[PDB]
Amino acid sequence: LGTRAKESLDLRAHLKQVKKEDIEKENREVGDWRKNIDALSGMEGRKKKFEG
Amino acid sequence: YLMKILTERGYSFVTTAEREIVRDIKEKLCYVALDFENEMATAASSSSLEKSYELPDGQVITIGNERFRCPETLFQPSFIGMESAGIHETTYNSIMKCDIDIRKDLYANNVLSGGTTMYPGIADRMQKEITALAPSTMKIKIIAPPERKYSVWIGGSILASLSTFQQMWISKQEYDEAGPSIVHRKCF
DSSP states (O other): OHHHHHHHHHHHHHHHHHHHHHHHHTGGGGOOOOOOOOTTTTOOOOSOOOOO | OHHHHGGGTTOOOOSTTHHHHHHHHHHHHOOOOSSHHHHHHHHTTOOSSOEEEEETTEEEEEEOTHHHHSGGGGTOTTTTTOOSOOHHHHHHHHHHTSOTTSHHHHHHTEEOOSGGGGSTTHHHHHHHHHHHHSOSSSOOOEEOOTTOTTHHHHHHHHHHTOSGGGGOSOOHHHHHHHOGGGTTSSOO
């Protein structure tokens, strides 16, 4: 019984390690943008839209 | 219609030359009422609306509630016997024929142009009407630039000044090859 429990736990732990290795590996892909605002109180362009 | 309702006070303009005088009266005096019934009730009790105007020969005239009844025809074309709905409801119908996903943008970017949209107080009446018709969540905004009258021509100048547009003209040799029916073709 102890041997069976040990082998089952070993297999489960090995699978969990294989998963968790890549789980911790590339977890920085969550870096994205937040798109805050600044009120753009300094835009003083001219009316020359020809490019559309 | 203004020339026809002025006859209710005694002023008769008939000649095709006097149509110009009635046009000047319309331009200088008429305005669009924010709420029609309240204005009709107010003009019938007080006299704060009666504005006078001097004809090309003297004999000043006084326009009463003809001021906001002339341009009201835009929102109730039943006045001149036309069946259709006003300019406040044909815009909403034109929007509702569009697809369901671009209605918010059209609601937010309603543009006015042309000469007749220069009546003082139309950009508020139209917004009130559309807000009454439209769903309560959408924001209704009416763009009314001060250079409304020449808006079409300014846009025409901008379009003619573009480099990308320079090859869309109907060149004369093309007309010589296909006749006047070239305009309906690719060169629209």
